[PDB]
Amino acid sequence: QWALEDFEIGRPLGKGKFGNVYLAREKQSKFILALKVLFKAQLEKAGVEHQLRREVEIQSHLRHPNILRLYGYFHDATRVYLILEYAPLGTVYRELQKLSKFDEQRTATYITELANALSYCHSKRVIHRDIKPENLLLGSAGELKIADFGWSVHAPSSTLDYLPPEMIEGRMHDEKVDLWSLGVLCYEFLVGKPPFEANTYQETYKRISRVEFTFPDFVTEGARDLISRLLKHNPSQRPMLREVLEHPWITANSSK
């Protein structure tokens, strides 16, 4: 029974394809939160109703510290308003821009929090399929929080920088999608670029399907081992989030 007049809106937190995320405070409780204002125009013209519902669906019943919470939603005659947890330290995307690349301690800790959140999600057959820095938010304690479950789906289903080969090639894909993305992320955190970056979508597609990536010298063998395990063309060869959390390079550098 919410309404746009229940909130004071302020700082824009980010511009999206279908709308914008705004800082907002609930007038009666003074509760600070983010308001994602999606436009039905663009949404309907794209047919992302099940995507939007699945986002509200999944992210509502997903309660986890390393997952951005969705408190509720409402809509008027044009826009759809998602009332989201506010992440005061912004995106991991912005932090990479700021720090260029991450040390093994910060990286291994974000990977740990990711695997936890992803382990909670996979235990419910929920697979994100869009794990990338701009969807990784930071809480007040710097804790990583996965957001944007638009492309989230249950069980198997059917840029490119973070998508595994099965997805970009259209095949059927399961939880192992996020394990691949996790390896792409681990790489981007240490190197500052994702491993299959190219100047064109068509080049990146080739590099992903062939799994053509090389490590800079400053990438330690421990991180290389984890990443090579996650970036296996074959989803079944990719580890599970538990070999990842139990991977010696993680336990050595993670503060969790």
Author numbering: 127 to 284, 292 to 389
What did the article's authors report about this structure?
Aurora A kinase is one of the key regulators of mitotic events, including mitotic entry, centrosome maturation and spindle formation, as well as assisting in neuronal migration. Aurora A has attracted significant attention for the development of targeted agents for cancer because it is overexpressed in a wide range of tumors, including breast, colon, ovary and skin malignancies. We note that in Aurora kinase sequences a tryptophan residue, Trp277, is immediately following the DFG motif and displays a drastically different orientation whether Aurora A is in an active (DFG-in) or inactive (DFG-out) conformation. This Trp moiety is unique for the Aurora kinase family in the Ser/Thr kinome and its position is suggested to be important for tuning the substrate specificity.
A plethora of X-ray structures and functional assays led to the general notion that dephosphorylated Aurora A and, more universally, Ser/Thr kinases are in an inactive conformation and that phosphorylation or activator binding induces the active structure. Our results are consistent with other crystallographic studies on wild-type, dephosphorylated Aurora A in its apo or nucleotide bound state, where the kinase was also found in the active conformation. The following observations support our hypothesis: (i) two crystal structures for the apo-protein show Trp277 in very different environments, (ii) Danusertib has been proposed to selectively bind to the DFG-out conformation based on a co-crystal structure, and (iii) the same slow step is observed for binding of both Gleevec and Danusertib. The broad line shape for the Trp277 peak hints at severe exchange broadening in the surrounding of the DFG-loop and is consistent with the high B-factors for Trp277 and its neighboring residues observed in all crystal structures described here. The number of crystals for each structure is one for apo-Aurora A and Aurora A + AMPPCP and two crystals for Aurora A + Mb + AT9283.
